[PDB]
Amino acid sequence: AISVDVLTKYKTAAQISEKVLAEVSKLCVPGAKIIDICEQGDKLMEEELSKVYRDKKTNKGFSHPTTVSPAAFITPYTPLRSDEKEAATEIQPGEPIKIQLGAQIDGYGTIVCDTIVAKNANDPDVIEGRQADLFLATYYANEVLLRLMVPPGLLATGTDEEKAKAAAVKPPSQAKISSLLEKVAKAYDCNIIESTTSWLFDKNEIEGKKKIILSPGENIKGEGVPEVGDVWGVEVGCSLGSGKVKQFEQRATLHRRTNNTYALKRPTSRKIYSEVQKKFGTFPFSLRQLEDERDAKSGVIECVRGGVFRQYEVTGDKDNAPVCRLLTTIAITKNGITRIGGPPAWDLSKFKTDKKIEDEEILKILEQPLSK
């Protein structure tokens, strides 16, 4: 069981992340410059952070930089101010924008990601066409995934014999999880984004010792099963295209410190390394967050080459089609699955399409509860 102390720190992080997410989503209007939004989000996060756990030397910070990703972007986007062309990128109207960010208290982080439609306050709320399909695929993929993560039998009802039959059912393989989510996307003629990964979280860790990898494809596979006591960053992504991923040309700015001990030779490497250890610890950060972009670009090179920073390469839809993503931080307890921190529920009434999930296996899963 997760202690009150730990659960409460995750929860403090979630409330901060959800509040910053809401403030950042309001800034995502057509014409807004992405770099301004990320900077403002990061600023908000720090303000919110300074308003809690003030007493004592309680560590705290970002679990994830504010990122704002256009239509076909998969890697969370957070560009440099000194990259003139990138830093002038503006929100395009009607595009699906991924906003992913998060906070961190005493090494317990919550990461959240919502996808919204870029628009002005007095634009219509309705989403239609294949864009409605893209969103609904992602929504239902998420609802299905979350239910596939409830440990077998935890919430089974009925006779003792039914309850025992449920608890003795093996946790679904990751291949089975994948094919079901693919089925969900297909009902909307969308595809799951290859290798979309959910990670176990732990103290100072957002890429823990268990992970679920959706539609792995080839020489890749996830390992580990969700258990009562776990906290997970649960992610789903869909594409109006094939759901294939490809490297784009924007500068990689998203990184995180690893636990590798490689000795850095270059002084700007060590300098940036120490700056990051102190501010972010082992949590993801954007190069734009560092004190000096020129130092950032110089030192990051050896840090990545040496394996002490992990670099998250810039990727986007291989077909250059729009993508949709959700990321929820959950807790698994006695009572099932609780969403500690995530995106605000979507009003399904706003989505307009003829498409519908018809597969019986999937509709049945959707009837299963997430918790008691």
Residue numbers in the entry: 12 to 383
Published text:
Expression, purification, crystallization and x-ray structure determination of this protein was successful, supporting the value of C. thermophilum as a model system for structural studies. The two selected adaptive proline mutations (P41, P104) indeed occur in loops of ctArx1 preventing unfolding. Another fundamental concept in thermo-adaptation of proteins is an increased bulkiness of hydrophobic amino acids within the protein core. Direct sequence comparison of ctArx1 with cgArx1 indeed shows that 80% (16/20) of the hydrophobic amino acid exchanges lead to increased bulkiness. Several of these adaptive bulky hydrophobic residues in ctArx1 (F146, F362 and W357) together with V128 form an extended hydrophobic cluster, which together with adaptive C335 leads to a tight packing of helices α3 and α9 to the central beta-sheet. Acquired electrostatic interactions are found between the imino-group of W357 and D124 (β4) linking β4 to α3 more tightly and between adaptive R350 in β13 and E154 stabilizing β13 with respect to helix α3. Mutation of F146, W357 and R350 reduces the thermostability of ctArx1 by about 2°C to 51°C. In addition, mutation of the two hydrophobic residues (F146, W357) on top of the five adaptive mutations leads to a further decrease of ctArx1 thermostability to 47°C. Taken together, these examples of adaptive mutations in the context of the 3D structure of ctArx1 illustrate how individual residues and their interactions contribute to a thermophilic adaptation. By solving the 3D structure of a single thermophilic protein (Arx1 of Cth), we could identify three different types of adaptive mutations : (i) loop rigidity by increased proline frequency, (ii) increased protein core hydrophobicity, and (iii) increased electrostatic interactions stabilizing neighboring secondary structure elements.
